[PDB]
DNA sequence: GTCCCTGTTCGGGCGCCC
DNA sequence: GGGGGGCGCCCGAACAGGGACT
């Protein structure tokens with residue numbers, strides 16, 4: 001088949017990211033997967049005169065005897081030349097991995113060199129083994145694009161036959177929502193997979209926001225109120241309606257932290273007012289597809305994680321909470337969090353967020369691939385957060 | 396002979412042209428050596444004489460080789476290298492004897508004149524023009540001084556070995572440039588037959604294997620080690636002994652010890668390492684500190700004793716044990732059977748202006764894990780001098796995600812501990828201090844001070860300071876003037892973030908003094924409040940320190 | 943905006959291997 | 961004396977970001 005020419009963004013050069021060390025398990029898998037891909041003409045061996053590189057690793061689904069290869073194409077995607085509102089409302093949504101579909105389309109010869117990657121060896125027994133792609137690579141943003149036309153053709157009948165079903169794709173992923181019973185949904189999914197075979201679970205209606213909420217108690221110490229005023233002072237950035245004037249007034253003087261303060265009539269009111277302001281939703285937040293979704297996550301402790309998505313500060317598109325059983329592995333939990341938040345954002349806006357991760361770069365890089373199960377990878381950066389904001393979203 | 400392998404196409408960077416560079420003057424002894432080498436290569440088709448139709452040129456010299464009875468022709472291609480395209484290096488690291496498995500039969504081979512067996516691209520040959528003066532040539536093979544040569548050689552060597560590896564999946568070939576360690580589970584006779592097969596295979600591809608460099612019996616010399624059948628050792632290390640030390644000599648001593656720490660436990664180099672903190676040139680002499688002087692002897696003593704590593708049994712677990720050396724210095728041993736080290740090492744990086752021993756221990760674990768993954772491709776089990784409870788406290792309290800993989804406590808002091816603990820709730824019957832700082836950006840003058848619920852107030856004037864500093868000074872002063880239990884309220888995110896992280900060491904004299912106080916105290920509680928919102932009595936103290 | 947502090951990255955010197 | 965690539969180690973420059981202040 002003839003190939004679509006593909007460009008880099010102008011003034012931009014191909015990726016040059018160093019491969020990280022892999023475990024024996026992942027390397028054995030990769031070497032296995034790669035030799036087959038080489039037989040099927042899908043990838044070719046290349047030299048070091050190709051100066052590009054993109055990291056590669058591998059993930060093992062659940063309890064299975066099958067590894068999926070996974071190329072970190074985040075950089076390449078950034079450098080590569082350049083949504084169903086109903087889907088977030090289905091009672092059930094299944095995610096299928098239709099990446100295989102891509103290996104059937106060839107890839108622009110003049111582009112192949114940017115898809116170079118390297119298999120490492122245990123103990124550097126040998127130099128890296130370098131490959132490049134000859135077909136459309138999973139994980140590359142160019143892949144759904146080129147293949148979109150053929151993707152519509154596969155589906156148009158299934159859609160005609162099932163007009164109540166919404167099918168969405170994000171790179172290697174097919175998101176499929178229905179309003180059916182389970183079993184009816186599942187049997188319907190097996191239908192699409194069988195329909196897909198001839199060509200060659202989520203519950204977005206139990207997604208919940210985590211509101212800001214204020215302590216309720218019968219006696220207040222100076223400390224209780226000092227915390228309260230500070231938390232409200234910050235919240236008043238997210239809701240201009242909040243006020244901490246009356247409550248401040250009680251902190252007139254210079255008093256012992258454990259002194260109890262009887263709440264005045266006004267202060268009792270301002271407090272009631274504020275409780276209500278927090279219930280009334282964030283006015284004026286318009287999703288902009290020309291800007292990046294930022295995600296912040298705060299570790300709350302004891303398996304509780306809180307998160308917010310916004311493109312501009314204090315202008316949250318969403319704010320959430322993430323609960324987990326209270327041998328807890330913080331790093332495992334955080335990457336399970338990041339995966340679930342990315343999933344939501346793909347569904348709600350069909351785009352991945354930039355994460356600000358509350359962890360040390362090296363801790364995270366040492367371990368996150370042990371817990372990854374997605375076919376995509378969000379951009380991210382690392383932050384040592386003000387322990388101020390942790391108390392703000394505290395439940 | 397020259398490999399019949401395909402060349403690897405290379406090119407200059409765009410807009411660039413080959414190197415024109417005068418051949419600096421050589422010693423006679425070397426010119427004699429070079430024509431000896433050149434007349435030989437030229438017969439062998441490895442270099443070609445050029446005419447005037449070649450504009451370019453690049454210097455050339457020769458250093459004796461390691462045996463020191465033969466010479467190595469080198470070319471200072473520093474300039475050509477600036478103008479040659481980029482390569483992606485394919486050599487990802489360095490094989491380590493501790494990652495080798497026990498083999499029934501072992502061999503070590505070198506290739507004879509390795510680079511000069513691999514053909515260089517035709518179109519790129521002109522740029523290699525050089526001149527032997529007493530006759531001027533270009534290269535037809537890879538030269539030793541070009542930045543293309545290592546990756547091209549390493550990659551070619553890998554292509555050449557692929558067929559053999561495919562055919563002999565169970566013979567293990569550690570390939571380091573042209574060095575080959577070949578191991579098998581065969582009896583010596585059958586192994587030797589396989590080695591002949593390997594050698595003929597390399598010969599058909601143009602790579603000779605001189606018997607001089609063919610090891611057949613142990614101990615094998617390989618990558619700077621000696622490999623005996625059940626143990627390995629590093630080749631003897633020799634530290635300098637000057638009575639006057641320069642930066643260069645120091646750096647040369649640091650390196651040699653770092654290298655040593657892979658199998659000699661206990662090595663430390665902090666005292667040495669700081670010496671070169673300000674020093675701005677290799678030439679600069681430096682006086683040893685009594686501290687550093689003291690280190691060297693400790694190390695110098697460590698080396699005197701005999702040590703070895705063992706090979707890796709994959710059917711047994713990997714264990715790593717960490718010890719604390721004080722000063723942000725850590726040592727580890729990786730083993731499978733006790734008192735039989737696989738290898739050793741040290742961690743000593745200081746990440747952060749402020750930190751404590753639990754963070755540093757977490758950084759050690761991360762480092763050893765990454766390193767274990769490279770060498771054995773799996774994580775070790777840990778044995779750490781930290782109580783399970785200590786870790787849990789830290790993990791609970793800490794606001795970052797943090798984690799150590801499977802591990803077990805080992806009561807080998809000095810144990811790692813948190814040195815103080817902020818109260819989660821305000822302390823009843825503890826004086827409340829409202830601290831604050833202000834500083835003038837222009838004049839650089841400041842004030843730190845507090846106000847207490849018991850009527851006390853104090854203000855201290857500072858010089859050459861910063862807002863952040865005044866804010867830290869205010870906290871210090873309140874710790875200084877308070878009893879063993881104090882409640883402190885600050886409006887400084889900066890200060891609260893530092894202290895709340897429970898550091899026990901800091902680059903900062905001030906934070907060190909603060910840390911000192913915090914440890915002396917029975918109970919401390921740090922509250923934050925937002926500034927300039929008239930909150931009492933952050934309000935009253937803010938008034939005092941601003942003038 | 944500026945100044946301050948703290949983090950990352952990248953480029954030096956050395957070590958070791960070929 | 962004058963070269964190359966890899967990994968390691970330390971160090972100091974140049975950033976990048978956030979808070980606090982004019």
Ligand SMILES: Nc1ccn([C@H]2C[C@H](O)[C@@H](COP(=O)(O)OP(=O)(O)OP(=O)(O)O)O2)c(=O)n1
Nearest residue numbers: 505506507508509510511539540572573960964
């Ligand atoms: N200081 C060095 C040492 C080696 N090499 C390269 C070029 C060599 O060809 C190759 C392998 O090194 P050897 O010491 O084995 O040297 P040769 O294989 O060139 O020669 P010999 O026949 O003496 O082994 O690594 C280099 O560029 N610089």
Ligand SMILES: [Mg+2]
Nearest residue numbers: 505506507508
């Ligand atoms: Mg050789």
Ligand SMILES: [Mg+2]
Nearest residue numbers: 831832926937
């Ligand atoms: Mg102030």
